[PDB]
Design a protein around this nucleic acid. Structure first.
Length: 490
DNA sequence: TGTCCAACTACTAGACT
DNA sequence: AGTCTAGTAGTTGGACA
């Protein structure tokens, strides 16, 4: 457009920084980048309609809806259907927003309103499963296709409805389901794959792409390259599986002969989301790291054998220098922090925060390492920094207790939950912070603390035989699943 | 461009042994 | 205790108004 039109845009944008959404710059950048110009003007236009009854959406909910292709249509449609969906279909507001927060949002909402009753009633699905189906790019297409094919996939193919729901609940779910219908016999008969294995391949974005690529490339990979089919499955059962498989074919020689790696290793690098990026990056850096960084092949393999493997490997080559030299951690400690999904992130946050955390909070490099060295390390590091102060002082914990709660997967979630529940658990139900610490000092610390507090709030008679000191042991032994499974058995 | 649909890459969390 | 797996965010490409 023209300069005048720009200025209006920048001005409707500015009006959004105030009432009633009070959007910040990050949020406006999200809407512009993901929902486009129209999405931004739409939000501005309907802002009072959306933040008031009967919608009562949050500024964050409005953003999640707007930030997609067609956002404006999702927003328009959301104001039309949310009340009917919540009131007449039992859906919650969060659920309607989850359905709305994907490209084609408007088509998915209208289709749920139309098909939810038939899906739940004539195929025994729950509202929770209809929502998981609808809540992808293309949701309308997945929903209509489950309606057409769920009977034949079950009768003529022996899949369970759960399996048909898992196949449908991805972007491209319509494609995945028609493909499974097509190739499930062939892949089992001609290739010796179990139905369960076809389902695993099909249950990711581009599931159709992966099934077709398995049907093609499986022979060459097995017969020529010698791979087991089970290893071909494992490669394919990931986002962008077809790219993984194409890439293994190409690089399986150049990596097993030139760089000496074993087929067993190349498979482990491919069997993750973005496995193609992983392989090509190992190809390109194995010499560079095993000569100018003193890193063994095995270490390189372990670094690359996780989703985002390419990101971690490049982040290692770039920071193994400084982190050792300027901070002091051994190639062992750097290889550990990188050896997780999101490894690149944990590495950059340890670049940043090793000094601040030690200087302002008194932590060791060894502690810092222990916190960065889990999936989502970045998120635990940034939360220790943030909350360790209040946790130690408002809540009477030690710095080391705080490190222990941070030192598992979901450390960020475990920390925030303690700062939320620790009060009621000691005050209301008189629980020693030593107990609460130990329930949270495990993976799944968040849900286990939520589960235990549900019980001490509204006791189910199903758990009567278990004293509170027992519930704590269970929560510590196996967390939520341990509480939920004890409930199941009466 | 705007909208819908599909597919790929990466990150974060909880769970299963 | 390292792992396997689901959930999801962010982005890109094809297709067609």
């Amino acid at each position: 457009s023209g300069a005048r039109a720009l200025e209006a845009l920048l001005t409707v944008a500015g009006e959004l920084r105030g009432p009633p959404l009070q959007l910040d710059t990050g949020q406006l950048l999200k809407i512009a980048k993901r929902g486009g110009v129209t999405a931004v003007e739409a939000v501005h236009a309907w802002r009072n309609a959306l933040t008031g009854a009967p919608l009562n959406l949050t500024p964050e909910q409005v953003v999640a809806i707007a930030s997609h292709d067609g956002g404006k249509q999702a927003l328009e449609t959301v104001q039309r259907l949310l009340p009917v969906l919540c009131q007449a279909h039992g859906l919650t507001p969060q659920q309607v927003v989850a359905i709305a927060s994907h490209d084609g949002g408007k088509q998915a909402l209208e289709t749920v309103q139309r098909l939810l009753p038939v899906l739940c009633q004539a195929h025994g699905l729950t509202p929770e499963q209809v929502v998981a189906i609808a809540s992808n790019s293309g949701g309308k297409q997945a929903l209509e296709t489950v309606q057409a094919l769920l009977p034949v996939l079950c009768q003529a193919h022996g899949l369970t409805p759960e399996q048909v729901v898992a196949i449908a609940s991805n972007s491209g779910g319509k494609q995945a389901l028609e493909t499974v219908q097509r190739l499930l016999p062939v892949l089992c008969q001609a290739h010796g794959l179990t139905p369960q294995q076809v389902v695993a391949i099909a249950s990711h974005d581009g599931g159709k792409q992966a099934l077709e690529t398995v049907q093609r490339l499986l022979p060459v990979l097995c017969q020529a390259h010698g791979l087991t089919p089970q290893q071909v499955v494992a490669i394919a059962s990931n986002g962008g599986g077809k790219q993984a498989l194409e890439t293994v074919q190409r690089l399986l020689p150049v990596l097993c002969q030139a760089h000496g790696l074993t087929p067993q290793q190349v498979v482990a690098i491919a069997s993750n989301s973005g496995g193609k990026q992983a392989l090509e990056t190992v190809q390109r850096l194995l010499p560079v790291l095993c000569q100018a960084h003193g890193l063994t092949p095995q270490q390189v393999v372990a670094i690359a054998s996780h989703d985002g493997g390419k990101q971690a490997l490049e982040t290692v080559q770039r920071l193994l220098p400084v982190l050792c030299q300027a901070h002091g951690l051994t190639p062992q400690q750097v290889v550990a922090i990188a050896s997780n999904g999101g490894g690149k992130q944990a590495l950059e946050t340890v670049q940043r925060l090793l000094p601040v955390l030690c200087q302002a909070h008194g932590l060791t490099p060894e502690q810092v390492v222990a916190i960065a060295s889990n999936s989502g390390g970045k998120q635990a590091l940034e939360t220790v920094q943030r909350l360790l102060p209040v946790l130690c002082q408002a809540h009477g914990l030690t710095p080391e207790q705080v490190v222990a709660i941070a030192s598992n997967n979901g450390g960020k979630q475990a920390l925030e939950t303690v700062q939320r529940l620790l009060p009621v658990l000691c005050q209301a139900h008189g629980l020693t912070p030593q107990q609460v610490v130990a329930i949270a000092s495990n993976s799944g610390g968040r849900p286990a603390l939520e589960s235990i507090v549900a019980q001490l709030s509204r006791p189910d008679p199903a758990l009567a035989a278990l004293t509170n000191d027992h519930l704590v042991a269970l929560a510590c032994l196996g967390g939520r699943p341990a509480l939920d499974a004890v409930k199941k058995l009466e």
